[PDB]
Enzyme design. Sequence first.
Site, PDB file in Angstrom:
ATOM      1  CB  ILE A  19      -1.025  -0.026   1.160  1.00 46.16           C
ATOM      2  CG1 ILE A  19      -0.376  -0.118   2.539  1.00 46.16           C
ATOM      3  CG2 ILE A  19      -2.037  -1.149   0.969  1.00 46.16           C
ATOM      4  CD1 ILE A  19      -1.301   0.271   3.666  1.00 46.16           C
ATOM      5  N   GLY A  20       1.906   1.252  -0.883  1.00 47.52           N
ATOM      6  CA  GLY A  20       2.650   2.462  -1.283  1.00 47.52           C
ATOM      7  C   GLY A  20       4.124   2.431  -0.903  1.00 47.52           C
ATOM      8  CD  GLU A  21       9.036   2.331  -2.132  1.00 46.65           C
ATOM      9  OE1 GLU A  21       8.297   1.516  -2.723  1.00 46.65           O
ATOM     10  OE2 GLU A  21      10.096   2.004  -1.563  1.00 46.65           O
ATOM     11  CB  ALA A  23      10.313   9.078   4.142  1.00 48.47           C
ATOM     12  CE1 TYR A  24      13.969   9.888   4.742  1.00 53.18           C
ATOM     13  CE2 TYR A  24      12.863   9.214   6.756  1.00 53.18           C
ATOM     14  CZ  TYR A  24      13.330  10.215   5.924  1.00 53.18           C
ATOM     15  OH  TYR A  24      13.148  11.517   6.268  1.00 53.18           O
ATOM     16  CG  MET A  26       7.903  -1.547   1.404  1.00 52.82           C
ATOM     17  SD  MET A  26       7.791  -2.841   0.156  1.00 52.82           S
ATOM     18  CE  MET A  26       9.456  -2.770  -0.505  1.00 52.82           C
ATOM     19  CE  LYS A  42       4.953   5.509   9.159  1.00 52.81           C
ATOM     20  NZ  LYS A  42       5.734   6.767   9.295  1.00 52.81           N
ATOM     21  CG  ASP A 137       5.300  18.161   4.954  1.00 48.85           C
ATOM     22  OD1 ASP A 137       5.006  19.019   4.067  1.00 48.85           O
ATOM     23  OD2 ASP A 137       5.619  17.014   4.719  1.00 48.85           O
TER      24      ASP A 137
HETATM   25  N1  LIG Z   1      -1.505   4.178   9.067  1.00 53.28           N
HETATM   26  C1  LIG Z   1      -1.600   4.102   7.738  1.00 53.28           C
HETATM   27  N2  LIG Z   1      -2.599   3.368   7.191  1.00 53.28           N
HETATM   28  C2  LIG Z   1      -2.645   3.244   5.856  1.00 53.28           C
HETATM   29  N3  LIG Z   1      -1.844   3.768   4.922  1.00 53.28           N
HETATM   30  C3  LIG Z   1      -0.874   4.494   5.494  1.00 53.28           C
HETATM   31  C4  LIG Z   1      -0.692   4.708   6.845  1.00 53.28           C
HETATM   32  N4  LIG Z   1       0.423   5.512   7.052  1.00 53.28           N
HETATM   33  C5  LIG Z   1       0.871   5.778   5.846  1.00 53.28           C
HETATM   34  N5  LIG Z   1       0.118   5.191   4.858  1.00 53.28           N
HETATM   35  C6  LIG Z   1       0.334   5.300   3.417  1.00 53.28           C
HETATM   36  O1  LIG Z   1       1.734   5.394   3.222  1.00 53.28           O
HETATM   37  C7  LIG Z   1       2.028   6.649   2.550  1.00 53.28           C
HETATM   38  C8  LIG Z   1       2.198   7.787   3.536  1.00 53.28           C
HETATM   39  O2  LIG Z   1       3.303   7.574   4.445  1.00 53.28           O
HETATM   40  P1  LIG Z   1       3.439   8.601   5.688  1.00 53.28           P
HETATM   41  O3  LIG Z   1       3.389   7.850   6.980  1.00 53.28           O
HETATM   42  O4  LIG Z   1       2.515   9.761   5.516  1.00 53.28           O
HETATM   43  O5  LIG Z   1       4.924   9.145   5.430  1.00 53.28           O
HETATM   44  P2  LIG Z   1       5.578   9.735   4.093  1.00 53.28           P
HETATM   45  O6  LIG Z   1       7.057   9.566   4.300  1.00 53.28           O
HETATM   46  O7  LIG Z   1       5.006  11.124   4.002  1.00 53.28           O
HETATM   47  N6  LIG Z   1       4.975   8.775   2.900  1.00 53.28           N
HETATM   48  P3  LIG Z   1       4.626   9.181   1.347  1.00 53.28           P
HETATM   49  O8  LIG Z   1       4.863  10.655   1.105  1.00 53.28           O
HETATM   50  O9  LIG Z   1       3.200   8.888   0.946  1.00 53.28           O
HETATM   51  O10 LIG Z   1       5.510   8.392   0.413  1.00 53.28           O
HETATM   52  C9  LIG Z   1       0.783   6.794   1.678  1.00 53.28           C
HETATM   53  O11 LIG Z   1       0.674   5.784   0.682  1.00 53.28           O
HETATM   54  C10 LIG Z   1      -0.257   6.571   2.776  1.00 53.28           C
HETATM   55  O12 LIG Z   1      -1.552   6.553   2.215  1.00 53.28           O
END
Ligand SMILES: Nc1ncnc2c1ncn2[C@@H]1O[C@H](COP(=O)(O)OP(=O)(O)NP(=O)(O)O)[C@@H](O)[C@H]1O
Length: 344
Positions: A19-21, A23-24, A26, A42, A137
């Site tokens: 469910i996505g990539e 910061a550091y 997946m 994460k 942010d």
């Molecule tokens: N608790 C969670 N439940 C579901 N999806 C999550 C959750 N936390 C993060 N994500 C997903 O993971 C990514 C967001 O990560 P996040 O914790 O906001 O840090 P980030 O480093 O900002 N990630 P990103 O910018 O999306 O690459 C997106 O795909 C979100 O929709």
Amino acid sequence: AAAAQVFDVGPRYTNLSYIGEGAYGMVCSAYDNLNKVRVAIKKISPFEHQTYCQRTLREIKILLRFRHENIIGINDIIRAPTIEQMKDVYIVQDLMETDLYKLLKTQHLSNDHICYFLYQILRGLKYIHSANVLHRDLKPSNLLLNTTCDLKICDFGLARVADPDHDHTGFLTEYVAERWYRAPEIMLNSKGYTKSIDIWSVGCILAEMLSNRPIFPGKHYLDQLNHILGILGSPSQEDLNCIINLKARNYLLSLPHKNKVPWNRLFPNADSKALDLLDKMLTFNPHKRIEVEQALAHPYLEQYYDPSDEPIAEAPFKFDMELDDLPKEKLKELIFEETARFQP
Ligand SMILES: Nc1ncnc2c1ncn2[C@@H]1O[C@H](COP(=O)(O)OP(=O)(O)NP(=O)(O)O)[C@@H](O)[C@H]1O
């Protein structure tokens, strides 16, 4: 080691789904074979880079200290039992079905959803600001939602302890947080060490909930100011008198006169109470900008507003975390110590 690369969340967490990539690393959903609920994990792989270790430590320290319904919690942290074997850290959170960015791309929001989302953003932000912390942010992608429209603020990687005494800087000083949600003072004279920078970002999010598009979609650092001033119009003599830095002041004075574009022109079907609050959040002068507690008390939010049910932090951060110039090796040791309480 379960793979998806290595996604080594041991026996407890199974049925991984990408469910996505991040910061550091997946992000995966996973089944918690203990609590019989799906969870988000994460994977963070930051120990190479001093910047990645800084943001990881800051985020872990904040999210372990915070306890609030509108802020993502850490349920678990998985890492090796020794510093030597520790390469990755896995952060386990409540699974949230979507985020406001994904929602705004696909869904019309009712006035009731806009109202409820904004309420929950400000209620969480009240707690954050109460802890003397700035998020720095806030944007749609950092607001998670579940299938019953519960909203949780995430991503404290760029967060700082507030420091208004040390906010002043020169014109066009470089910055990290997403351009479209950056307050005008960032480009003019501000390091973004005051609470008013978060309120600007919330106002941008409110405008984006009313239209499903970003209100100030600047293509570069200084185009961002073009965008803001095209709508707010030329700053008043009073607001210019608060900008003492000659480069910033003379830049603003060099621009052609522009009258304010009234919010009801941009958002002709918006609730007029929503536009009155928007106006107060997107004030050019950060000293006149509405504060989080005044925003909660605004008539737009009167169906939700209950300050007895809008808690503040027990233990504010008194001083900033002096992470600025720690060797990544000392930061790996601090991450190790901060994550110890989850070790069996
Ligand atoms: N608790 C969670 N439940 C579901 N999806 C999550 C959750 N936390 C993060 N994500 C997903 O993971 C990514 C967001 O990560 P996040 O914790 O906001 O840090 P980030 O480093 O900002 N990630 P990103 O910018 O999306 O690459 C997106 O795909 C979100 O929709």
